[PDB]
């Protein structure tokens, strides 16, 4: 039985069936924008809440937004980056690589096992949300994890392999049981005569198990990498980080970069560290610093983004050669990123991924910058359950490790 079949079988049990499990779903933004295409419509032609209604009609007990999981990843990865920076300023190495793309993680383990220590220990948004629901939410609702099935809808054909990593288990209890792609889900709806464009607005569930809505605030973060950078930057400097604009790197396909200059906040420990101490296949060059005549030092964070895997191999070679100098690097296996993932609908439109990206968020939400640490649902989870980012409980549920040679 395929994972689609297993999931549908669980949903086929009447809710009052004594062998019926609690079945929940989480949905990626890239799925939400592309699912309209499965009906021959434009990206974003169906609303987030129409999709939530559609999923509920399949028999899902809870319907979650993967963006809640991404708030968790931003919390942990922003903290991890800042921690690595602090340790390096006072003399888990740098540069740091993101860890959300399983295509990258597979290549890392098989082809670059020596780079393992440089990779973020964070789990992906979907795996963080799944770990959370089978632990925190299970406890809150008085439901045994064994009686819980979680499904995720992803634009990606590699997300099941991510979910299947052996140790992503609960206390064979899987944190995330089944991954379904955008097109597979689109097919499920069409086969059941569900037309998403004709559905009423439904509603999301909060993974916290109380209140209404998806448990994510209004607005956009700019994505996990930018938001992790913002978390670190704003704590370091005491000043806001605007939306980033990445620029194409000359002579290297699929690579974009930005340099972020950071002056420590006055009176901060960061200011102290820079002053008090002025003096590995990828050796950190001690970082790119700057100073002024009066002694106001700063560091420039050198950030790169690679799409996709061939292009990433060429970046790594340059990095190892010392020809490319970066402090924080995001590698995505797909040329267009997740909106162009292998589980997405096929279009004759060469610019379909541009249309999908543009429709990801409305102009209203686009104009409002969201910060994960300000989300009351996230605050409550840390305050009452997780403890501190990077802490013992957070590490146990939300972090992971890598296996040289692969799994």
Interface ranges with ligand SF4 (CB under 6 A): 101-103, 155-156, 158, 332-334, 337-338, 341
- Which helix (H) or strand (E) segment holds residue 8: the answer is helix 3-12
For residues 79 and 126, which CB has a smaller minimum distance to Cl ion in the complex?
126
Range in contact with Cl ion (rule: CB under 5 A) among 108-116, 118-126, 347-355, 387-395: 118-126
* # residues near Cl ion by CB under 5 A: 3
Residue 178 beta carbon to ligand SF4: minimum distance, rounded to whole angstroms:
16
Q: How many CB atoms neighbour CB 278 within 10 A? A: 9
Among 44, 54, 78, 125, binds Cl ion (CB under 5 A): 125
Residue 195 beta carbon to Cl ion: minimum distance, rounded to whole angstroms:
28
How far apart are the C-alpha atoms of 98 and 165, rounded to whole Å?
18
- Which helix (H) or strand (E) segment holds residue 262: the answer is strand 255-262
Which residues within the stretch 288-347 sit at the binding site for Cl ion (CB under 5 A)?
none
The three-state secondary structure class of 361 is coil
- What is the full DSSP assignment across 114-156? GGGGGB--BPPHHHHHHHHIIIIIHHHHT--GGGEEEEEEES-
The reply to whether 181 sits near Cl ion by the rule CB under 5 A is: no
Burial 108-145 (b: 16+ CB within 10 A, else e): bbeebeebeebbbbbbbbbbbbbbbbbbbbbeeeeeeb
337 binds, among Cl ion, ligand SF4, none (CB under 5 to 8 A by kind): ligand SF4
Is 169 annotated as ligand-binding? no
For residues 95 and 155, which CB has a smaller minimum distance to ligand SF4 in the complex?
155
Range in contact with Cl ion (rule: CB under 5 A) among 117-125, 163-171, 297-305, 337-345: 117-125
**Residue in this structure with the two tokens 């061939």, named with its chain if needed:** 310
Residue 230 beta carbon to Cl ion: minimum distance, rounded to whole angstroms:
19
- What is the full DSSP assignment across 34-90? HGGGGGT--TT-S-HHHHHHHHHHTT-SEEEETHHHHHHHHHHHHHHHHHHHHHHH-
For residues 237 and 307, which CB has a smaller minimum distance to Cl ion in the complex?
307
Residue 158 beta carbon to ligand SF4: minimum distance, rounded to whole angstroms:
5
Residue 356 beta carbon to ligand SF4: minimum distance, rounded to whole angstroms:
12
> Taking the chain, what is the end-to-end CA distance rounded to the nearest angstrom?
22
For residues 29 and 345, which CB has a smaller minimum distance to Cl ion in the complex?
29
155 binds, among Cl ion, ligand SF4, none (CB under 5 to 8 A by kind): ligand SF4
- The residues that bridge with 328 in the sheet, in sequence order, are 96, 303
Residue 127 beta carbon to Cl ion: minimum distance, rounded to whole angstroms:
7
The reply to whether 29 sits near Cl ion by the rule CB under 5 A is: no
Nearest to 183 by CA among 38, 56, 44, 60: 38
For residues 72 and 324, which CB has a smaller minimum distance to Cl ion in the complex?
72
Residues at the binding site for [4Fe-4S] cluster are: 101, 156, 334, 338
User: Where on the chain is the footprint of Cl ion (CB under 5 A)?
Assistant: 124-126
């Amino acid at each position: 039985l395929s994972h689609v079949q297993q999931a549908l079988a669980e949903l086929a049990k009447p809710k009052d069936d004594p062998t019926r499990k609690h079945v929940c779903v989480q949905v990626a933004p890239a799925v939400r924008v592309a699912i309209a295409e499965t009906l021959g419509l434009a990206p974003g032609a169906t609303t987030p809440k129409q999709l939530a209604e559609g999923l509920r009609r399949l028999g899902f007990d809870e319907v979650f937004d993967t963006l809640f999981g991404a708030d968790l990843t931003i919390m942990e990865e922003g903290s991890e980056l800042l921690h690595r920076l602090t340790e390096h300023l006072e003399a888990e190495p740098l540069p740091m690589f993101t860890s959300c793309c399983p295509g990258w993680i597979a290549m890392l383990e098989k082809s670059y096992p020596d780079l393992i220590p440089y990779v973020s220990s964070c789990k992906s948004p979907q795996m963080m949300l799944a770990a959370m629901v089978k632990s925190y939410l299970a406890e809150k609702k008085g439901i045994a994890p064994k009686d819980m099935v979680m499904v995720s809808i992803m634009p990606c054909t590699r997300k099941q392999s991510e979910a299947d990593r052996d140790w992503f288990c609960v206390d064979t209890l899987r944190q995330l049981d089944h991954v379904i792609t955008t097109v597979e889900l689109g097919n499920i709806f069409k086969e059941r005569g569900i037309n998403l464009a004709e559905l009423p607005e439904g509603e999301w569930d909060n993974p916290m198990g109380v209140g209404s809505g998806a448990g994510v605030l209004f607005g956009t973060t700019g994505g996990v990498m930018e938001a992790a950078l913002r978390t670190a930057y704003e704590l370091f400097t005491g000043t806001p980080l605007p939306r980033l604009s990445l620029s194409e790197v000359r002579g290297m396909d699929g690579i974009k970069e930005t340099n972020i200059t950071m002056v420590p906040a006055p009176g901060s420990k960061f200011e102290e560290l820079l002053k008090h101490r002025a003096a590995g296949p990828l050796a950190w060059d001690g970082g790119a610093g700057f100073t002024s005549e009066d002694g106001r030092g700063g560091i420039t964070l050198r950030v790169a983004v690679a799409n996709g895997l061939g292009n990433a191999k060429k970046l790594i070679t340059k990095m190892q050669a010392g020809e490319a100098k970066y402090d924080f690097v995001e590698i995505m296996a797909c040329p267009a990123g997740c909106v162009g993932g292998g589980g997405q609908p096929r279009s004759t439109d060469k610019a379909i991924t541009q249309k999908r990206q543009a429709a990801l968020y409305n102009l209203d939400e686009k104009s409002t910058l969201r910060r994960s640490h300000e989300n009351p649902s996230i605050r409550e989870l840390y305050d009452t359950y997780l403890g501190e980012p990077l802490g013992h409980k957070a590490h146990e549920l939300l972090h992971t490790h890598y296996v040289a040679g692969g799994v």
